[PDB]
Structures are given as C-alpha cells and as structure tokens.
Amino acid sequence: SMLTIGQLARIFEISTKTLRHYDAIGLFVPARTGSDNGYRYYQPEQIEQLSRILALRRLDVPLEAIDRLKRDGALDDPQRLRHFLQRHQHTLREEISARQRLLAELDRTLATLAHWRIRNMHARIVERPAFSVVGMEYFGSAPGDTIGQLWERFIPREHEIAGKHDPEVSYGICAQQPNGEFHYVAGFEVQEGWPVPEGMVRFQVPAQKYAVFTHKGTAPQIAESFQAIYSHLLAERGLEPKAGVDFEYYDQRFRGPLDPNSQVDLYIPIY
Amino acid sequence: SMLTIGQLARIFEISTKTLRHYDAIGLFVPARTGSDNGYRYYQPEQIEQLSRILALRRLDVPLEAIDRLKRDGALDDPQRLRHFLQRHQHTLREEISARQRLLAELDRTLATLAHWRIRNMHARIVERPAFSVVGMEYFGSAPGDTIGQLWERFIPREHEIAGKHDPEVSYGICAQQPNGEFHYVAGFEVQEGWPVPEGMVRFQVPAQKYAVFTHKGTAPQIAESFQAIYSHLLAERGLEPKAGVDFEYYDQRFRGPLDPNSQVDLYIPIY
Ligand SMILES: Nc1nc2c(ncn2[C@@H]2O[C@@H]3COP(=O)(O)O[C@H]4[C@@H](O)[C@H](n5cnc6c(=O)[nH]c(N)nc65)O[C@@H]4COP(=O)(O)O[C@H]3[C@H]2O)c(=O)[nH]1
Ligand SMILES: Nc1nc2c(ncn2[C@@H]2O[C@@H]3COP(=O)(O)O[C@H]4[C@@H](O)[C@H](n5cnc6c(=O)[nH]c(N)nc65)O[C@@H]4COP(=O)(O)O[C@H]3[C@H]2O)c(=O)[nH]1
Ligand SMILES: Nc1nc2c(ncn2[C@@H]2O[C@@H]3COP(=O)(O)O[C@H]4[C@@H](O)[C@H](n5cnc6c(=O)[nH]c(N)nc65)O[C@@H]4COP(=O)(O)O[C@H]3[C@H]2O)c(=O)[nH]1
Ligand SMILES: Nc1nc2c(ncn2[C@@H]2O[C@@H]3COP(=O)(O)O[C@H]4[C@@H](O)[C@H](n5cnc6c(=O)[nH]c(N)nc65)O[C@@H]4COP(=O)(O)O[C@H]3[C@H]2O)c(=O)[nH]1
C-alpha cells in the first residue's frame, strides 16, 4: 500500500523529478528509500500533504515560500496555513481592485481622445459630378447602424456585381426624402448598361459640392462624427449643409468596421 | 441648418418613431413644426441634448426616469445630472459586488460537492482476463494531464485502427515499470493479428482482479478520484492495491473530457 514516486506523480500529474526536487530540499520527503533499488517510497497518508504543497503552487506561491511554511510549522497547521491564504487572497483582491481603478482612469482618458480626434477632423471642399451606384438599398427610418448589419447582409452578395468601375472603393449612401425618412444604399460605382443582381438596385448620386471629413476610427463611431459635423464643425467654417445625398467613402484606408485603424471619408453636401 | 427628424434619427441611429414619441411626451420637443407639411424640425443645438437623453437610455435608465429629470430641471444641469449618474454608478458597483460575494459562496459549495461525490464512489470487484490494446503510447513520468494532450493527439489518428473489437469503448492504460516511471497508453481493444498503424503500439493488459470506481465528472477531476482511491477508499473497504496495470474505461457514458456529465470507470488492480 506504499506508493512509488511514479504512482504518486501519476495521480498528481506531476513529474518524478519534482518529487526528487522536493526530497532534496526536505520539503516533501518519502517515508523511506528502497533498500535494494534506492527508490523512494511514500505512504498513502502523505497524499493529502503533497496535495496541499501542490495546491499552493497552483496559486503561484513560490517554492521557497512553501519551504518556509514547512520549516516554521505553518504548512502543517490548518489555522496558520489558512491565515497565510487569506493574506494572499487579500493581496489578490487588492491588485485586482487597483487595476480596476486604472481601467476607469483609462476609460476616462479614451473619451478625452475622442474630443481631440474630432477637433482634428478638417473639412476639404470638393465638387463631384453625378455617378451611378449598384448595391443593396434599404428604404426607411430604422434604428441602429443596422447598417453595420446591412453591410454584413451585403458583403456575401457583393461578388455578384458586374461592371464595377473601381472595385477598390465602395459607398455608404444616404439620401433624404421630403417625406422625412432616409434612403440608405450600400454599393459600388458601376457604369450604366450593366445588369443589376437580383434584389439589388441602381442609385444615381447627383452632381454636388461637398465638405469632406476624414473619420479616423471605428464604424460605430461614424455616428459621433456626423453629430459633430452637424452640431458645429460646418458652422465653425461658415459652411451650410444642403439637402441632398451624403455618403460614406470606403477605399484602401478602410479595414473593417470594428478596426480602430480604419479611415472613412464622409461626403457632406453643402451650399 | 435646421435638421429634419430624418437626419437627426440617422446621425443617432434611431428611428423617427422614437423622436415622435419623445415629442408627444414633451421629453425632446423639436424647435418647430413644418407649416406646409406638418413635419418636425430641430436646431443643431438640440443634438448634444438628444445625445444625453440617448446616453441615459444606453444605461437602461428608463424613459420615465429621464422624463422626471427633464421635468425637475436636473437633466439640463451638468451637476445634478452628474449626481444622478454617480448614484446609478454606485448601485451598479454594489450589484456587481453582491454577485461576487455569491460566486465565492458558490465556489465554496461546489467544493463541498466534491467530497460528497467521492463519498458515494463505491468499489465493485471484478476479475478480467488478459486483453490486447492498440493505440498511442507514451513512455515516461510526465507532468500535466498532457494525457489530456495525448488523447487529443490520438483522436485524429483513431480512424486508422483496423480490427477494433468494440469501437464503442476505449482505454486509458497506465502500467508501472520497476524503474518507477509509468507507461501510459490510449487505445482500443483489437484482436491479435491485425496490423498496427504507424507510430502506434500494441499493449497487452494482463489478467487481473480489480476494484472498479465510477468517476462521475470531468476528466481533469480524474486525478482527484485516483487520489481518494489511494489515500483511503481502498483501505476503508479492506482492499489492498496490487502492482500492475490500471486503466480508465470509456464507453457510452463518456461525453468528453470537459463535460461535467461524463462517467469513466477506473480499474484498479488489487490483491
Ligand atoms: N524492490 C523494492 N520494492 C519496494 C520497496 N518498497 C516498496 N516497494 C514496492 O511497493 C510495493 C508495496 O510496498 P509495501 O507498501 O512495503 O508493501 C509490501 C510489503 O509490505 C511486503 N513485502 C514484499 N516484499 C518485501 C520485502 O522484501 N521486505 C519487506 N520487509 N516487505 C515486503 O509486501 C507488500 C507488497 O509488495 P510487492 O507486491 O512486492 O510490491 C511492493 C514493491 O513493488 C523496496 O524497498 N524494494
Ligand atoms: N517578516 C518578514 N520577513 C521577510 C520579508 N521578506 C523577506 N524577509 C526576510 O528576508 C529573508 C529572505 O527573503 P527573500 O530573499 O525574499 O527569500 C525568501 C522568500 O523568497 C521566500 N518566502 C518566504 N516566505 C514567503 C512569502 O510569504 N511569500 C513569498 N512570496 N515568498 C516567501 O523564502 C525565502 C526565505 O525566507 P526566510 O527564510 O523566511 O527569510 C526571509 C525573511 O527572514 C517579509 O515580507 N516579512
Ligand atoms: N417644406 C418645409 N421644409 C422645411 C421647413 N422647415 C425646414 N425645412 C427643411 O429644412 C431645410 C433647412 O431649413 P432652415 O434651417 O429653416 O433653412 C432654410 C430657410 O432658412 C430658408 N428657406 C427656404 N424656404 C423658406 C420658407 O418658405 N420660409 C422661410 N422662412 N425660410 C425658408 O432656406 C433654408 C434652406 O431651405 P431648403 O434648402 O429648402 O431646405 C430646408 C427645408 O427642406 C418647413 O417648414 N417646410
Ligand atoms: N424620493 C423618491 N420618490 C419616489 C421613489 N419611487 C417612487 N417615488 C414617488 O412615487 C412616484 C411614482 O413612482 P413610480 O410609480 O415608480 O414611477 C416613477 C418611476 O417609474 C420612473 N422614475 C422616475 N425617477 C426615477 C429614477 O430616478 N430611477 C428610476 N429607476 N425610475 C424613475 O418614473 C416615475 C417618476 O414619477 P415621479 O414624478 O418621480 O413620482 C414618483 C415619486 O414621487 C424613490 O425612490 N424616491
């Protein structure tokens, strides 16, 4: 009923070298040594002990910490050992708490960057002629950038589009109707004459003057950009919005909606 | 530079119904109504306001709470508004805390379940004759259930094995060597005479008497089961372990190493 270094190591999923190591340092020592083979032998009573020694290591308690507990008799006392552990528990809770306080201060600092980014978003003025776009429309005042959801409805189907004048760039078009809903469209510039994939439309973006803003960030943060633009950015440059169609401009600089390194040009029609 | 319900709703990704709603309740009322179309029109100065109303909603602040704030002047006061929010922030921290306190108490209870399960793990005695097993062998006193790792090394290769006498059941065999290492093997019972997939072995489990323990739980918890077995479960039944080969027994009752619903018979050779 005595166990070998190998049976012990097995049931605890450790290597026999560890158990040798523990023997040299007098931490966990075998009840005896094989008198005809020099092997180490352990009693079943030692199992629960190795179990605690190993329980400490899973808590990253350094080995010598452990050895000190062995030496001063605290490892083999359920009360002292418990004390050691609550102390370590306490430290862990604190280190966690401390970092939480940091994530808040960090959360705080990210916001401040947003006002900074928006402060640096300068208008370039430009006129562009009418042009044609084919893709997936959505007529209607809907909540969400369920457009983030539209784009993901549109991406599997993009390949279907013949006649792409420049497949490197795409558009997130929003048109106003006097009725008051917006008509959004995700698409690609295509020459007239090409066929429209089933369930797709062809939209004509009229000739317009624009203020172009380079949104440098995430697609969900696009709405914030629009908000600044319409609350003050235009005015601050004595520009007036014109009723018309605006669009998001996606080219090489765009690398995914959730990717903070994506730029997107915002084409705001003006007077 | 007045915006429509439609441009407003878009740049905030909400539906125009929401803006109608906010107007009827007097919460967010447009600066005017279209006199030739009865439409609603908003000033760019209302953007930041709608912005905060909506920020509250993202905090699940109910709408009526919000309307209360609007009514009692607090909503338009950066100081009162801030106070409202720290209050709410406070509540959230408390609710989180409370639940942590419960996770700990829950952790404690899970542990107590373990001793209970081990107490109910009864030995059934059984003799089985020698039998042959084919699979992937590991020689050597290794740490970790890198046996968890062996099984996942072995599984892509299982299909290769011809002559499987009973593919429903596999074995996790551990054999002891005089030098004290253990020799582990994951495999299937296969009749003699069948060829051995390259890099695989054929191990012979000798005829033995066993105590069988049904481990009901997770493969990582298998080691604890072994620990109970050799520390006292055998003694309590006046059984004595015999030097030999033990094995884990996987049949239908086994549903995967991570599934708390798996059972595994543990075959412990005895006198
Ligand atoms: N070569 C060697 N092996 C060791 C030694 N100490 C432990 N073992 C291994 O541990 C098993 C059981 O050891 P035990 O608890 O002393 O329990 C032992 C022990 O109580 C007794 N026993 C067997 N042979 C001897 C012996 O030569 N001298 C003594 N004093 N007792 C023995 O029978 C039980 C079963 O022994 P086994 O079935 O042979 O299997 C033995 C043996 O494989 C050692 O000093 N030398
Ligand atoms: N009262 C007190 N005395 C301290 C403290 N830190 C160091 N000492 C003293 O300095 C000696 C060596 O510390 P070390 O180089 O960290 O080397 C230490 C340390 O690395 C490790 N150790 C012992 N206890 C603990 C522990 O509770 N936690 C950790 N992380 N390591 C420990 O074992 C080694 C030997 O320690 P000792 O033989 O006890 O001897 C210790 C101890 O007498 C402390 O925080 N409080
Ligand atoms: N049908 C209708 N539409 C409305 C009303 N209120 C706002 N809008 C829409 O909002 C846009 C800008 O309105 P604004 O800021 O008053 O700025 C307006 C306003 O300052 C001026 N304006 C144009 N027509 C009229 C008018 O009939 N009366 C007044 N007082 N001003 C007008 O020209 C600016 C640009 O107007 P638009 O480019 O046409 O585009 C207008 C129009 O499409 C309304 O009561 N009825
Ligand atoms: N001092 C105080 N008075 C309370 C409290 N709970 C209820 N009352 C009183 O009871 C009235 C109706 O509360 P309700 O039916 O929960 O209906 C409430 C509630 O459903 C919601 N609401 C208002 N303020 C808050 C708020 O701060 N937090 C939340 N979660 N909901 C609010 O809107 C309604 C507000 O109506 P009121 O004009 O405030 O009128 C409130 C208020 O005068 C409280 O915790 N503290």
Residue numbers in the entry:
A (entry chain B), B (entry chain A): 0 to 270
Q: Can I see the authors' text?
A:
BrlR, a member of the MerR family of multidrug efflux pump activators, consists of a structurally conserved N-terminal DNA-binding domain and a C-terminal GyrI-like binding domain. BrlR mediates the antibiotic resistance of P. aeruginosa by activating the expression of multidrug efflux pumps and repressing PhoPQ activation. The monomer can be divided into three domains: the N-terminal DNA-binding domain (residues 1–75), which adopts a winged helix-turn-helix fold; the long central α-helical linker (residues 76–119), which connects two terminal domains; and the C-terminal multidrug-binding domain (residues 120–270). Our most striking finding is that BrlR is not only a pyocyanin receptor but it is also a dual receptor that is responsive to both c-di-GMP and pyocyanin.
The structure of the BrlR–c-di-GMP complex belongs to space group I4. Each asymmetric unit contains two BrlR monomers and four c-di-GMP molecules. The monomer of the BrlR–c-di-GMP complex contains two c-di-GMP binding sites in different regions on the DNA-binding domain. The DNA-binding domain contains two separate c-di-GMP-binding sites, and shares a mutually intercalated c-di-GMP dimer in a stacking conformation with a crystallographic symmetry related binding site. Thus, the overall structure reveals a receptor–ligand complex with a 1:2 stoichiometry. The structure shows that the 2′-hydroxyl group of the c-di-GMP molecule in each site points toward the solvent and is not involved in the binding to BrlR. Crystallographic symmetry analysis indicates that the BrlR-c-di-GMP complex also forms a stable homotetramer, which is made up of two dimers as the final model of apo-BrlR (AA′ and BB′). Overall, the c-di-GMP-bound BrlR has a larger positively charged surface than apo-BrlR on the DNA-binding domain, and the simultaneous occupation of the two c-di-GMP binding sites twists and bends the DNA-binding domain and the coiled-coil linker. The recognition helix (α2) of the HTH motif is 1.2 Å shorter (Cα(H20)–Cα(H20′)) in the BrlR-c-di-GMP complex than that in apo-BrlR, which could help BrlR approach DNA.
